[PDB]
Scaffold this active site. Structure first.
Site, mmCIF file in Angstrom:
data_model
loop_
_atom_site.group_PDB
_atom_site.id
_atom_site.type_symbol
_atom_site.label_atom_id
_atom_site.label_comp_id
_atom_site.label_asym_id
_atom_site.label_seq_id
_atom_site.Cartn_x
_atom_site.Cartn_y
_atom_site.Cartn_z
ATOM 1 N N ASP A 1 0.840 -1.188 0.000
ATOM 2 C CA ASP A 1 0.000 0.000 0.000
ATOM 3 C C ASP A 1 0.880 1.243 0.000
ATOM 4 O O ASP A 1 1.852 1.326 0.754
ATOM 5 C CB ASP A 1 -0.920 -0.010 1.220
ATOM 6 C CG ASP A 1 -1.964 1.086 1.180
ATOM 7 O OD1 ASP A 1 -1.593 2.269 1.312
ATOM 8 O OD2 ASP A 1 -3.162 0.765 1.026
ATOM 9 N N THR B 1 -3.568 5.748 -3.928
ATOM 10 C CA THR B 1 -2.462 6.472 -3.313
ATOM 11 C C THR B 1 -1.220 6.452 -4.198
ATOM 12 O O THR B 1 -0.639 7.502 -4.507
ATOM 13 C CB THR B 1 -2.152 5.866 -1.948
ATOM 14 O OG1 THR B 1 -3.199 6.192 -1.028
ATOM 15 C CG2 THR B 1 -0.840 6.403 -1.432
ATOM 16 N N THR B 2 -0.798 5.259 -4.620
ATOM 17 C CA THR B 2 0.366 5.162 -5.491
ATOM 18 C C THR B 2 0.116 5.886 -6.804
ATOM 19 O O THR B 2 1.010 6.555 -7.337
ATOM 20 C CB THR B 2 0.713 3.696 -5.744
ATOM 21 O OG1 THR B 2 0.653 2.969 -4.513
ATOM 22 C CG2 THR B 2 2.106 3.575 -6.326
ATOM 23 N N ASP C 1 -9.307 -1.161 2.179
ATOM 24 C CA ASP C 1 -9.387 -0.671 0.806
ATOM 25 C C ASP C 1 -10.655 -1.168 0.121
ATOM 26 O O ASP C 1 -11.345 -0.400 -0.565
ATOM 27 C CB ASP C 1 -8.150 -1.103 0.018
ATOM 28 C CG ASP C 1 -6.997 -0.131 0.163
ATOM 29 O OD1 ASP C 1 -7.113 0.819 0.965
ATOM 30 O OD2 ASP C 1 -5.972 -0.315 -0.526
HETATM 31 N N1 LIG Z 1 -5.505 -7.278 -13.443
HETATM 32 C C1 LIG Z 1 -5.152 -6.019 -13.795
HETATM 33 N N2 LIG Z 1 -4.627 -5.755 -15.009
HETATM 34 C C2 LIG Z 1 -4.274 -4.509 -15.367
HETATM 35 N N3 LIG Z 1 -4.404 -3.436 -14.574
HETATM 36 C C3 LIG Z 1 -4.918 -3.558 -13.332
HETATM 37 C C4 LIG Z 1 -5.328 -4.887 -12.861
HETATM 38 N N4 LIG Z 1 -5.793 -4.722 -11.612
HETATM 39 C C5 LIG Z 1 -5.690 -3.404 -11.310
HETATM 40 N N5 LIG Z 1 -5.164 -2.714 -12.336
HETATM 41 C C6 LIG Z 1 -4.908 -1.258 -12.366
HETATM 42 O O1 LIG Z 1 -3.953 -0.918 -11.364
HETATM 43 C C7 LIG Z 1 -4.341 0.271 -10.681
HETATM 44 C C8 LIG Z 1 -4.370 -0.011 -9.190
HETATM 45 O O2 LIG Z 1 -3.048 -0.024 -8.673
HETATM 46 P P1 LIG Z 1 -2.851 -0.131 -7.086
HETATM 47 O O3 LIG Z 1 -1.666 -1.015 -6.792
HETATM 48 O O4 LIG Z 1 -4.202 -0.419 -6.482
HETATM 49 O O5 LIG Z 1 -2.478 1.396 -6.759
HETATM 50 P P2 LIG Z 1 -3.214 2.175 -5.564
HETATM 51 O O6 LIG Z 1 -2.931 1.309 -4.363
HETATM 52 O O7 LIG Z 1 -2.546 3.524 -5.540
HETATM 53 O O8 LIG Z 1 -4.662 2.216 -5.986
HETATM 54 C C9 LIG Z 1 -5.726 0.647 -11.167
HETATM 55 O O9 LIG Z 1 -5.638 1.833 -11.957
HETATM 56 C C10 LIG Z 1 -6.179 -0.500 -12.039
HETATM 57 O O10 LIG Z 1 -6.799 0.004 -13.221
HETATM 58 MG MG LIG Z 2 -5.379 0.453 -5.122
#
Ligand SMILES: Nc1ncnc2c1ncn2[C@@H]1O[C@H](COP(=O)(O)OP(=O)(O)O)[C@@H](O)[C@H]1O
Ligand SMILES: [Mg+2]
Ligand SMILES: Nc1ncnc2c1ncn2[C@@H]1O[C@H](COP(=O)(O)OP(=O)(O)O)[C@@H](O)[C@H]1O
Ligand SMILES: Nc1ncnc2c1ncn2[C@@H]1O[C@H](COP(=O)(O)OP(=O)(O)O)[C@@H](O)[C@H]1O
Ligand SMILES: [Mg+2]
Ligand SMILES: [Mg+2]
Lengths: 66, 527, 526, 533
Positions: C58, C91-92, C389
């Site tokens: 996270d 957040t990221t 989350d």
């Molecule tokens: N299976 C997947 N394939 C491609 N992109 C994905 C997948 N799952 C999530 N994402 C993308 O990754 C992003 C989420 O990244 P994440 O690690 O949750 O960052 P944060 O914690 O800041 O939300 C979202 O924009 C989503 O569209």
């Molecule tokens: Mg996320």
């Protein structure tokens, strides 16, 4: 078993309640005159606690975390 | 160099392969230390604290706590082992060994350019298959005394000396069978583990009653009452002060005498109620009263009770209220407003034991006690601590066996069978996760390896003998610790708790998967 | 004697050096967690200065555990905290976006363009991005539980709990649904107060469940009371059930023989009167935030009532919501409506070596506890963060039923829309507009980089695909490094999360672009 | 290529001040060496010819003695293995009372021979199994070695003869006189009921006149004085009170509320009259000695002096309980006059001075009572302390005799017979455990060897003579102390006998300690840090 501090654990978990912006750090004094003119100044109603340490010696990081 | 060091100059950072190497090295060191603990042929370790306290142990969790380690990955593994000990009470050394072997086998493939994610996927698939096989291999069986004895032996022999294990097996199995109600969860609080330090280690035994670490506080109390009524109470029979700042006012010495006499009427009323109950219950000298009170008793009340031939104890433990109400069969009372003969416990023998400056009271010959005590005897403090840890492990093992009628053959036979099942299932796994499945099987194979190594035999030769025998016969053959030949664990009587194996698999896989996916270790809280 | 205008410790830094330093600090803060985005993110180990270990991917936790000196980094960390508190996700994404926008702004700052022009262009681009994001959104039927579970899954495929996806999704959805409340014409969720997460190390993760009630770590005061009640009538209190000193100074003066005994008997009678007032409602369970006297325990026990004492106020409020009771601080004013009926079972059972109290069969409960079983404390902490989350995403969807394609599709579509809109400006400010428009490609680029596939080829193919007409939902399959249509893959994110991320990143860039002078070392003067 | 780094793994993860020892040479051999060093330190104080050792503890307090338990407890032993052996010795002291030096010497010899066996090729498990087998064999053999029994404990001469051997090792020069004193003291105690209480024997140390002037008093002696004017009672009527000799007061808070002049004038008169009435009521029961466990009020003291009542104030509640036991009174909690069944009696109470210390004596004319005291004289505090330690050893020997009446020959006769029989058994046993059994048998030789070394003769000649004589079959033959040439004599005629129970428990504890030390394979010591106590 109240002699064994039942509430010690639960106090430990809800002591992890930083909540607000960051967690800050203890004030570091690098001048003796700084210590003297900060203890001399400031309101005397509240308590002032000072920690003495030397880098490297054990028994310091735990105190700073506390 | 690193971004964190750019922000925080005095920050320690391990990145990319460095973090994985650090974690794997820490796990390997922990495994190297804890290898010698596994099996009844393992070696004792002496642990000396800062103050000089001596502790002899073979328990994996106890060793982890007393190991002088300052590493993060070791801390994580120690927390996992602590949870394993807390829930099931066994398998801590196996937990650490399996985690370390999983990490080592995973590194064996990661160093060949493989991404850790594929290894973790293989780990998950292998864990699913292994759980299925474990469900397929357990021996469901209603447990009489024999199976419980076998399980308790399989634990205590690994924990203590053989003869001491033989004594402790009967002790723990009898205690569990005594406190066990039909189709009810077993309450381990109802078994009191009291330790005395005068006899030899093999003199520890089971009392179908209760043992208290305090005795009568009046020298004129009876030291042994044959037939006893037990009055378990939580009423302060000592003097108490008014909550609202009472104070006394008088104008002469006679008034002072009157006030002094009249200030103890409140307590004397309770004492009189107890005395009247005792007189009504027994008018002869045949029977007797034992009054165990959770709160203190002032010397005046002690004298008043002793003049009536009532032995009384003060400042008892809170759990002793339930222990006495279940053993003697009385009712714990918080007040004497309406006390009746039916609220009195019974005990066929109560006597007081003196040991140095320590004083003990035995409440024996209960009708059908639901709470017994395990009296530990030994010539040393560290001997008592070792026996206490071993008895905890044995109690947990017996309770776990009772909880679910299934029991798993031991001696590493189930590990070998699961390894072969995983190897056979490997072609069904699609992709490069077959490497992770193979690593999981090889990691599972550590238990027979460590057992054979501790027994002093050749590792690989014994392992291949076991595997060949199991493949050609299909039986659950384990590692014999006296000859090294294959042996059927079920027939010999080497049993393992099914819950322990399931928890081992789940926790080891989860923690290894989490560690393998870590690519950076940071300490950026300073400055 | 060194006479100076300002104090000796005061240090002033000014010029383009300040802007370069701020932008570099923001870039480095972004690079801290650049690798922790996407379904193939790698977790990090944080060594807490208090001695604990935090293992997470996270963004907010990682950035919170880091102590920094450059105040631009502090601004970025505050941005992360704000994004976490407002919506609970992205957040990221917001950190990376802020870093990228600041980089493309430093581009123009190296030339002779004033920062105010960049600020104006950024604000115009923010308005256009909000418009486009609203445009390309789709509605959702909240009644369909399958769609909600799919949304939560898309929210939790990037975390360690992803291996148990159906279980976590069901837990989060049930908790959020049953904590939903409405009173006096006001609708609320209140995930923070109710919907507690209680973690007990040990067991297996698949044993985790959400209870139709509240579980607390408390035991009966006296062993003789029942530990298993079928249909309890629960009564909750704040006041202690023991004799206590008065507020004013109330010293007594005893001059008669029988006044001491009378005083003590009056204390006992007052306790008995309180217990009788409680008993008059004929309940089965009495819960008190404060102590219960031993005599009070006896008088309740004589009426066959289970008593539990010393419960936290939050736990008591949760129990009140779960069993439909009202906390009463004066037993003499206890009403029938205050008695809590609705709990369908109360049971005290031993887990491990410690007693736990369950009220876990409530019909229509407005509060719940989530029981987490796991390998250890750190694993359970990460699982709780993932559950938080998921619940935040579920509540965002419930509040706003709009969804936006994820996995880089939204960023690429918005970038293309803004690039096309910028073709008709013919001003000096069109260049920063276009630059901040294409700065949104850092999210698909980061997804591809974490996946392991080639960045340039995949990104060029994605841009070419998005240049077509109906291709707004074409994103990057973060697991295989191939282009897919996210109406087929099924990755979707709430419109609120994307809007908050874009707004926060743009305003972070705006805030850090207005600074050209840094002074430090002066006292607080408080 | 100038430094050897710490090996990866556990070596690097170790703490700063911690120490890790593993393997045979690093751990087991070193533990054996430490235990051998401890045994060497204590060895020279064994037997009648043992030598006292001036030991000064950290508190700069001087101890001179040859009691092994006292020497060990006055030494801050640091090595954990030697700590374990000291724990075994202290456990033997607590269980029996004598034999701590035997435990330590036997454990040292066993560990040394175990080290030799490990060096010649045997394994730790084999050695431990061999010692356990040999210990079981020795415990089997021991009952057959009993030469005689106490057969009477109400007699003075027989009890003195039995107790002489125990207190001959300590205070070798003059053991008959101490034996007579302890025999008289123990015979006065130990009534027709078989139970004997060690704590019922009290020791009072009064300096000045040499230990030969010590005596036994049927009663108690307190190093105090009398508060009142009366200092001698001939028909004592002690009335023990656990409360202070003063008018009782309220327990919460008492204030004298005066509202008129007459109350103010009459308060003191009324209080004094009440005190006088209470004291006269006490005196009217015929009581003439009052013992109180609290303070003495001035007015109460005056009124007691008016009625010729002796006042004795005991500060410690234990002394009050002991006086109640030795007199026959009940510790009253109030100033109420004592009833006849609570009425304490004694033959004589008086104030006397011995040396230069005033003492109060509660003396019984009859040679019987619950508690008896030994008035110890001497020219030094340390000498009286040693006499007290010898008295404790003799009393513990009497208690053991009450528990078990069997006796075995001493002076190394029992050890030599045990070694011979265990060696004979070990030959019949095949397998590798025969070496461990034979070494266990040889470990018994350390007792006659220590006795011969302390007596100043050649140990080898004494041991060879003992083996020969036991080979013909005289199993009651040990070395002769009163000889300048290595010689042996029969112990039964010499009356040099030690308790069977002591030997049994000492062998068991020594074997257990040695085995437990051997079982240890790894040592993980932590940083000593602080630990003031
Ligand atoms: N299976 C997947 N394939 C491609 N992109 C994905 C997948 N799952 C999530 N994402 C993308 O990754 C992003 C989420 O990244 P994440 O690690 O949750 O960052 P944060 O914690 O800041 O939300 C979202 O924009 C989503 O569209
Ligand atoms: Mg996320
Ligand atoms: N008599 C025996 N023969 C063969 N194998 C045994 C015997 N007793 C125990 N084992 C095996 O050795 C292992 C001992 O594990 P143990 O040392 O108790 O580790 P932990 O304390 O972590 O459970 C068990 O897994 C069991 O299967
Ligand atoms: N007069 C004696 N002649 C020979 N041996 C004796 C004599 N008196 C005592 N001993 C021996 O001395 C030993 C007692 O030694 P001691 O200093 O008391 O050590 P411990 O206190 O451990 O018994 C006994 O084993 C006994 O056999
Ligand atoms: Mg085990
Ligand atoms: Mg002796």
């Amino acid at each position: 078993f109240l002699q064994q501090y039942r509430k010690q654990r639960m106090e430990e978990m809800r002591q992890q309640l930083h909540k607000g912006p960051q967690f800050k750090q203890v004030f570091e004094i690098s001048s003796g005159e700084g210590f003297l003119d900060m203890i001399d100044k400031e309101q005397k109603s509240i308590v002032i606690m000072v920690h003495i340490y030397e880098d490297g010696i054990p028994g310091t990081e735990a105190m700073n975390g506390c | 160099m690193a971004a964190v060091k750019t922000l925080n100059p005095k920050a320690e950072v391990a990145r990319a392969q460095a973090a994985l190497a650090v974690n794997i090295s820490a796990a390997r060191g922990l495994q190297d230390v804890l290898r010698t603990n596994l099996g009844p042929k393992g070696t004792m370790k002496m642990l000396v604290s800062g103050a000089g306290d001596i502790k002899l142990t073979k328990d994996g969790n106890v060793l982890l706590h007393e190991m002088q380690i300052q590493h993060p990955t070791a801390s994580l593994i120690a927390k996992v082992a602590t949870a394993q000990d807390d829930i099931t009470g066994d398998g801590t050394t196996s937990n650490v060994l399996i985690i370390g072997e999983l990490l080592k086998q995973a590194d064996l493939y990661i160093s060949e350019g493989l991404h850790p994610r594929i290894i973790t996927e293989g780990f998950e698939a292998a864990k699913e298959k292994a759980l299925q096989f474990l469900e397929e291999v357990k021996v469901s069986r209603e447990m009489d005394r024999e199976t419980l004895i076998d399980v308790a032996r399989t634990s205590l022999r690994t924990k203590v000396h053989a003869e001491l294990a033989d004594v402790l097996t009967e002790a723990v199995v009898d205690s569990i069978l005594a406190i066990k109600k039909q189709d009810e969860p077993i309450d381990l609080f109802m078994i009191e583990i009291m330790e005395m330090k005068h006899k030899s280690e093999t003199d520890t035994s089971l009392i179908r009653g209760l043992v208290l670490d305090h005795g009568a506080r009046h020298p004129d109390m009876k030291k042994r009452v044959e037939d006893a009524y037990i009055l378990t109470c939580n009423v302060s029979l000592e003097y108490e002060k008014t909550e609202v700042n009472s104070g006394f006012f008088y104008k002469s010495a006679e008034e002072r005498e009157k006030l002094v006499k009249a200030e103890r009427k409140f307590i004397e009323d309770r004492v009189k109620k107890i005395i009247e109950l005792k007189r009504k219950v027994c008018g002869d000298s045949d029977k007797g009263f034992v009054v165990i009170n959770q709160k203190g008793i002032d010397p005046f009340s002690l004298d008043a009770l002793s003049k009536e031939g009532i032995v009384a104890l003060r400042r008892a433990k809170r759990r002793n209220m339930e222990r006495l109400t279940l053993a003697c069969g009385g009712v714990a009372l918080n007040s004497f407003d309406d006390l009746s003969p039916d609220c009195l416990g019974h005990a066929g023998l109560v006597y007081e034991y003196t040991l140095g400056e320590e004083k003990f009271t035995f409440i024996e010959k209960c009708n059908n006690p639901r709470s017994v005590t395990l009296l530990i005897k030994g010539p040393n403090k560290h001997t008592l601590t070792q026996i206490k840890d071993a008895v905890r492990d044995g109690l947990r093992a017996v309770k776990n066996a009772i909880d679910d009628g299934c029991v798993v053959p031991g001696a590493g036979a189930v590990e070998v069978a699961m390894a072969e099942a995983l190897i056979k299932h490997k072609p069904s796994v699609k992709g490069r996760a077959q490497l992770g499945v193979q690593a999981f099987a090889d990691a599972l194979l550590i238990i027979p390896k460590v057992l054979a190594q501790n027994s002093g035999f050749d590792l690989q030769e014994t392992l291949v003998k076991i595997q060949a025998e199991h493949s050609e016969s299909g039986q659950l053959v384990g590692v014999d610790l006296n000859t090294g030949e294959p042996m059927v664990a079920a027939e010999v009587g080497v049993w393992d708790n099914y819950c322990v194996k399931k928890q081992l698999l789940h926790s080891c896989t989860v923690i290894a998967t989490n560690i393998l996916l870590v690519d950076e270790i940071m300490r950026a809280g300073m400055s | 004697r060194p006479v100076l205008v300002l104090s000796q410790n005061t240090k002033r830094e000014s010029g383009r050096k300040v802007q370069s330093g701020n932008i570099n600090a923001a870039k480095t803060i972004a690079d801290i967690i650049r690798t922790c985005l996407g379904p193939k993110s790698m977790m990090k180990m944080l060594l807490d200065p208090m001695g604990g270990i935090v293992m997470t991917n996270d963004g907010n936790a990682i950035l919170r555990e880091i102590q920094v000196q450059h105040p631009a980094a502090k601004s970025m960390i505050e941005i992360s905290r704000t994004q976490d508190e407002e919506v609970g996700d992205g957040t990221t994404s917001v950190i990376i976006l802020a870093g990228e926008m600041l980089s493309v702004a430093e581009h123009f700052l190296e030339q002779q363009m004033h920062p105010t022009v960049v600020i104006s262009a950024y604000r115009k681009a923010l308005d256009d991005m909000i418009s486009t994001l609203k445009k390309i959104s789709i509605p959702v039927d909240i009644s369909d539980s399958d769609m909600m579970l799919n949304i939560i899954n898309s929210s939790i495929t990037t975390k360690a709990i992803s291996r148990w996806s159906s279980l976590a999704c069901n837990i989060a959805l049930d908790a959020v649904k049953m904590v939903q409340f409405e009173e006096n014409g006001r609708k609320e969720i209140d995930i923070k107060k109710y919907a507690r997460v209680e973690k007990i190390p040990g067991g297996i993760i698949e044993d985790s469940c959400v209870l139709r009630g509240v579980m607390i770590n408390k035991d009966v005061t006296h062993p003789r009371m029942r530990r298993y009640i079928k249909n309890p009538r629960i009564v909750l209190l704040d006041s202690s059930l023991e004799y206590k000193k008065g507020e004013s100074q109330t010293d007594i003066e005893i001059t008669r023989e029988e006044d001491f005994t009378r005083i003590l008997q009056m204390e006992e009678e007052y306790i008995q009167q309180l217990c009788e007032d409680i008993i008059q409602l004929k309940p089965d369970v009495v819960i008190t935030e404060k102590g219960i006297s031993d005599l009070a325990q006896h008088y309740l026990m004589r009426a066959n009532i289970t008593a539990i004492r010393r419960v936290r106020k939050t736990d008591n409020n949760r129990i009140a919501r779960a069993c439909g009771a009202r906390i009463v601080s004066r037993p003499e004013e206890l009403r029938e409506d205050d008695v809590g009926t609705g709990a369908g079972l109360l049971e005290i059972k031993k887990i491990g070596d410690e007693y736990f109290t369950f009220i876990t069969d409530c019909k229509d409960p407005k509060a719940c506890t989530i029981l987490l079983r796991g390998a250890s404390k750190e694993i359970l902490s990460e699982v709780e963060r993932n559950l938080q989350d998921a619940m935040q995403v579920c509540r965002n969807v419930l509040l706003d039923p709009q969804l936006v394609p994820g996995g880089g599709a939204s960023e690429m579509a918005v970038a293309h829309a803004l690039t096309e809109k910028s073709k008709a400006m013919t001003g000096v400010e069109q260049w920063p507009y276009r630059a901040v428009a294409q700065a949104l490609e850092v999210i698909p680029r980061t997804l591809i980089q974490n996946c392991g596939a080639s960045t340039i080829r995949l990104l060029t193919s994605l841009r070419a695909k998005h240049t077509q007409e109906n291709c707004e939902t074409w994103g990057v399959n973060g697991e295989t490094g191939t282009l897919v249509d996210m109406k087929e893959l099924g990755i979707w994110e709430p419109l609120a999360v994307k809007l908050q991320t874009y707004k926060t990143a743009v305003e972070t860039a705006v805030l850090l672009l207005r600074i050209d002078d840094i002074v430090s070392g002066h006292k607080k003067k408080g | 290529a100038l430094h050897v780094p710490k090996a990866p793994g556990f070596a690097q993860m170790l703490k700063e001040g911690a120490k890790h020892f593993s393997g045979l040479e690093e751990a087991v051999y070193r533990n054996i060496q430490a235990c051998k060093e401890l045994a060497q330190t204590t060895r020279t104080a064994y037997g009648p010819n043992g030598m006292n050792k001036m030991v000064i503890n950290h508190l700069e307090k001087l101890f001179v003695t040859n009691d092994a338990a006292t020497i060990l407890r006055e030494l801050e032993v640091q090595h954990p293995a030697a700590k374990m052996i000291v724990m075994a010795s202290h456990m033997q002291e607590q269980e029996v009372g004598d034999g701590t030096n035997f435990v330590l010497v036997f454990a040292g010899a066993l560990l040394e021979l175990a080290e030799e066996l490990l060096r010649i090729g045997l394994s730790v498990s084999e050695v431990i199994e061999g010692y356990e087998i040999a210990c079981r064999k020795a415990h089997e053999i021991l009952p057959n070695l009993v030469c005689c029994s106490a057969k009477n404990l109400r007699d003075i001469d027989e009890v003195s003869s039995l107790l002489r051997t125990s207190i001959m090792s300590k205070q070798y020069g003059n053991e008959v006189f101490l034996a007579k004193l302890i025999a008289q003291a123990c015979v006065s105690i130990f009534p027709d009921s078989g139970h004997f209480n060690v704590d019922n024997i009290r020791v009072c140390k009064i300096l000045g006149s040499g230990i030969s002037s010590s005596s036994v008093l049927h009663g108690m002696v307190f190093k105090k004085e009398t508060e009142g004017d009366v200092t001698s009672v001939k028909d004592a009527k002690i009335a023990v009170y656990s409360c202070p000799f003063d008018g009782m007061i309220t327990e919460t808070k008492g204030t004298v509320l005066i509202k008129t002049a007459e109350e103010l004038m009459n308060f003191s008169k009324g209080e004094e009259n009440l005190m006088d009435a209470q004291v006269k009521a006490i005196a009217d029961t015929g009581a003439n000695v009052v013992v109180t466990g609290g303070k003495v009020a001035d007015m109460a003291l005056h009124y007691a002096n008016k009625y010729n009542i002796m006042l004795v104030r005991l500060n410690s509640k234990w002394d009050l309980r002991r006086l109640c036991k030795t007199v026959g009174a009940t510790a009253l909690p109030r100033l109420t006059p004592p009833v006849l069944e609570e009425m304490g009696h004694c033959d004589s109470v008086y104030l006397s001075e011995v040396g230069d210390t005033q003492v109060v004596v509660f003396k019984h004319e009859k040679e019987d009572g619950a508690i008896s005291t030994i008035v110890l004289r001497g020219s030094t505090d340390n000498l009286m302390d040693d006499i007290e330690r010898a008295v404790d050893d003799g009393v513990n020997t009497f208690k053991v005799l009450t528990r078990d009446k069997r006796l075995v020959p001493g002076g190394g006769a029992t050890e030599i017979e045990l070694a011979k029989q265990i060696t004979s058994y070990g030959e019949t046993c095949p397998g590798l455990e025969q070496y461990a059994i034979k070494k266990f048998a040889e470990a018994f030789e350390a007792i006659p060897r220590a006795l011969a070394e302390n007596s100043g003769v050649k140990a080898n000649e004494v041991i060879s003579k003992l083996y020969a004589v036991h080979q013909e079959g005289n199993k009651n033959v040990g070395l002769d102390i009163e000889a300048e040439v290595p010689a042996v004599k029969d112990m039964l005629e010499a009356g040099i006998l030690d308790t069977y129970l002591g030997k049994y428990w000492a062998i068991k504890l020594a074997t257990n300690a040695a085995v437990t030390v051997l079982r240890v394979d790894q040592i993980i010591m932590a940083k000593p840090a602080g630990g003031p106590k």
